[PDB]
C-alpha cells in the first residue's frame, strides 16, 4: 500500500517556484516563496499544493534559532538550554567524542562476520 | 460585449456541424478565448455527477458527429473526452476546433482532457501538421493549436471517485496531490510523470514495467489497486489503446479502456464506446459503429 | 484601503481588457476595410459599364 | 536516495526494486528519482564541520 | 534590468500610448463609418441610374 | 524589455524585500543598544 502522506521540504518549493519564475517571468528572484502573483493560475494551485503538504522538522527550526543566536548574541541571544539526561551525556561524551567514535567502530569491524 | 460572441460562437458551431472549417482569424480568437478558459483549470479537474465519458477521438469527425448522435447533443449532454483528438485521422483540423468550441461555448458542460498526441512533435510527425497545411496554407493554425494543448488539464476526476485521464499512471505519481503539484503548461517532456500519465498503459505483469511503446510503464494490477485504495478512487477509467469490443474492463474492475473511435484499426474495425455515468454515478456503456458513408 | 494585491489584480485585469478591446477594435478594422474594397469594386463596375452603354449611345448618335 | 545518480539504463534494468521503492518509501512531491537525469566532499564537509564546531 | 524607476517609466509611456491610441481607433472608426456610408449611397445612386438608363433605353 | 508579469512580480518582491529589511534592521538595532546599555553599565 502507500501509507505514507506526502511532504515536501521548504528546499523543493523554492526551487520550484525559481525553476517556474525562471520559465514565466524571465528572470529568477532568489530563495523568496511568497511572491506568487505573475505566474499563471495551474501555478498558484501548485504552489498552494506545496505549501499546503510542506513538513517543517525541528532540525530547521533549530539551525534557524542557531544562526539566529550567532547573528545577536548579547540582545537577549543567551538562551538556557535543558539538562534532559540526552543533553548532559551530550555534555559528557563532548571532550573526548571522536575517539569513542572510532573505537566504537573499530570493535564493530573487529565483531563484523568477517 | 457578451451575448454578441456569444452568437458567433453559437454560428461557429452551426457552421461546424457541417464539416466547414473556420477562417484562420477565427481560430486564432477560438485559441485565445480557450487559453483564457483553460487557464482557470487544475491539473485535476472537479466534475458533477452526470456526465458521458469518451476517449480516444483521432480527428475522425464524422464518427464523432455520430457520437452525439448517440449520446445527444452537447448542451443537453455533459462530455468528458480523454485526449487524443487529433492525428491518424482527415478531418482533424475539424474536430479539434468542434471541441474546442464547444468548450469555449458551454464551459461547463464538456470537459478536455490532454493527450499523447497534443505535444508538438507527435502531431508534427503523424499528420495533423500537414492537415493544418493542407487546409489552410500555414502553420499559423498548428502553432495556436499547440499553444492551446500546452494548457489542457492533465486529468479528471468525476464525483471525486471517478479518476479519468488518457494513458494511465506513473511511478512518480502516488496521489492526486501529486498530480495537482505538477507544471502542466509546458510541453510534454520526455520524461516525467507527464511522459506517462499520457502514455503508460495497463497489463497482466504485476508493478510498473517498460512499455513496449517507448515512453511511459505498464502498471500492472496492484499498482492501479494500491492507488485507488490510497486514493479512495472507485474506478480509474483511460483511453489510449485499440480495443476492439470497444471498451474493457482491465484490472478487476479497477481500470476502465473506453475507446471511442470506430473503425481506427481497419485490419482489426473495432467499434467505438463510450460510458455514460448517471444521476447516481452509475456506469453504462453504448457501443456504436462508424456512420454512414 | 489600498491594498497591493488589489492594486496588481487591478493592474492585471486592466492590461487584459485593453487586449481584449484591441482585439475588437483590430478585427472590426479588418472588416470595415474589406468592405472598403467591396464597394471600391462595386462603384468601378458601375462606372465601367455606364462608360460603355454611354459609348454605345453616342455610337448610335453617330 | 540514490537511485537518480545510477543512470537510466539501471532503472530501465531494474524495476521490480523500483516497484517496490515505489509502494513501500514514502514519496516526496516534486521527487525526480524515477526520471532523474545526472560534487565537492571535502568542501561541504569542511563547511558543516564549522558551523558544527560554532555551535 | 527590473527597477522601480524603470517600472513608473513604463506604465506611463504605456498608458498614455493605449490613450493616444484609442483616440486613432476612435477617429479612424468615425472615418471608415462614414466612409461607408458614402459609398453606400453611391452604389445606391448608380442603382437607380442603372434603372433610369434600362427606363430610357426602353424608351428609345 | 518588460512584461506585466514581470512588473508585478518584481512590486510583490520589492514590498517582501523591505519588509525583511525593516525586520533585519530592527534586530541589528536591538543587539546595538544592548551594546551600548552594556558599556554604558
Ligand atoms: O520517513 P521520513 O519522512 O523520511 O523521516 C525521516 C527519517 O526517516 P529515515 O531516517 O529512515 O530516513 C527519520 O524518521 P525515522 O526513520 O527515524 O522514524 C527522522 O526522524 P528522527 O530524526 O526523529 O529519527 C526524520 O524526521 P525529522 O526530520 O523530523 O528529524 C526524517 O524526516 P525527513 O524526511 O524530513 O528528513
Ligand atoms: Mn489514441
Known amino acids: 500500500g502507500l501509507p505514507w502522506a506526502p511532504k515536501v521540504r521548504e528546499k523543493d518549493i523554492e526551487m520550484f517556484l525559481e525553476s517556474s519564475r525562471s520559465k514565466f517571468i524571465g528572470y529568477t528572484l532568489g530563495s523568496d516563496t511568497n511572491t ?11 504552489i498552494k499544493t506545496l505549501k499546503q503538504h510542506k513538513y517543517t522538522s525541528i532540525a530547521e527550526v533549530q539551525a534557524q534559532m542557531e544562526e539566529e543566536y550567532l547573528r545577536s548574541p548579547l540582545s537577549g541571544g543567551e538562551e538556557e538550554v535543558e539538562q534532559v539526561p540526552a ?28 | 460585449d457578451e451575448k454578441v460572441f456569444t452568437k458567433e460562437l453559437d454560428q461557429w458551431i ?27 483549470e487544475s491539473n485535476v479537474q472537479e466534475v458533477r455527477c452526470p456526465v458521458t465519458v469518451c476517449g480516444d477521438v483521432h480527428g475522425q469527425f464524422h464518427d464523432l458527429m455520430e457520437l452525439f448522435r448517440i449520446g445527444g447533443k452537447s448542451p443537453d449532454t455533459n462530455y468528458l473526452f480523454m485526449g487524443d483528438y487529433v492525428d491518424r485521422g482527415y478531418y482533424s483540423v475539424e474536430t479539434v476546433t468542434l471541441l474546442v468550441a464547444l468548450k469555449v461555448r458551454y464551459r461547463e458542460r464538456i ?34 493549436f499547440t499553444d492551446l494543448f500546452d494548457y489542457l488539464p492533465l486529468t479528471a476526476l468525476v464525483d471525486g471517485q471517478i479518476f479519468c485521464l488518457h494513458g494511465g499512471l506513473s511511478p512518480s505519481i502516488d496521489t492526486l496531490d ?3 503539484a505538477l507544471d502542466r503548461l509546458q510541453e510534454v517532456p520526455h520524461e516525467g510523470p507527464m511522459c506517462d ?21 505498464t502498471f500492472g494490477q496492484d499498482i492501479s489497486e494500491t492507488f485507488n485504495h490510497a486514493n479512495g478512487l472507485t474506478l480509474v477509467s483511460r483511453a489510449h489503446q485499440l480495443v476492439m469490443e470497444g471498451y474493457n474492463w482491465c ?5 476502465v479502456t473506453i475507446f471511442s473511435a470506430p473503425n481506427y484499426c481497419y485490419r482489426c474495425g473495432n467499434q467505438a464506446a463510450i460510458m455514460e455515468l448517471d444521476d447516481t454515478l452509475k456506469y453504462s456503456f453504448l457501443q456504436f459503429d462508424p456512420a454512414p458513408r | 484601503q489600498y491594498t497591493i494585491p488589489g492594486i496588481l489584480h487591478y493592474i492585471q485585469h486592466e492590461w487584459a481588457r485593453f487586449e481584449m478591446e484591441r482585439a475588437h477594435w483590430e478585427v472590426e478594422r479588418a472588416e470595415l476595410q474589406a468592405r472598403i474594397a467591396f464597394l471600391q469594386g462595386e462603384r468601378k463596375g458601375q462606372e465601367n459599364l455606364k462608360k460603355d452603354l454611354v459609348r454605345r449611345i453616342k455610337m448610335l448618335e453617330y | 536516495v540514490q537511485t537518480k545518480y545510477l543512470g537510466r539504463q539501471w532503472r530501465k534494468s531494474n524495476m521490480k526494486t523500483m516497484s ?29 564541520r564549522a558551523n558544527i564546531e560554532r555551535f
Open chain 2, 14 to 40: 452551426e457552421q461546424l456541424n457541417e464539416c466547414k472549417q473556420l477562417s484562420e482569424s477565427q481560430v486564432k480568437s477560438l485559441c485565445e478565448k480557450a487559453k483564457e478558459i483553460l487557464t482557470k
Open chain 2, 197 to 217: 500519465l499520457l502514455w503508460s498503459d495497463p497489463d497482466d505483469r504485476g508493478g510498473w514495467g517498460i512499455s513496449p511503446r517507448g515512453a511511459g510503464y
Open chain 1, 36 to 46: 506568487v502573483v505573475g505566474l499563471p493560475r495551474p501555478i498558484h494551485e501548485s
Open chain 2, 178 to 180: 501529486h498530480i495537482r
Open chain 1, 87 to 114: 543533553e548532559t551525556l551530550y555534555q559528557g561524551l563532548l571532550p573526548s567524542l571522536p575517539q569513542y567514535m572510532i573505537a566504537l567502530l573499530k570493535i564493530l569491524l573487529a565483531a563484523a562476520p568477517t
Open chain 2, 251 to 255: 484490472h478487476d474492475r479497477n481500470v
Open chain 4, 20 to 48: 517496490a521503492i515505489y509502494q513501500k518509501v514514502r514519496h516526496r512531491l516534486n521527487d525526480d528519482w524515477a526520471y532523474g537525469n545526472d560534487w565537492d566532499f571535502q568542501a561541504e564537509e569542511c563547511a558543516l
Open chain 2, 111 to 144: 470537459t478536455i482532457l490532454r493527450g499523447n498526441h497534443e505535444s508538438r512533435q507527435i502531431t508534427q510527425v503523424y499528420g495533423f501538421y500537414d492537415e493544418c497545411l493542407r487546409k489552410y496554407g500555414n502553420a499559423n493554425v498548428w502553432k495556436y
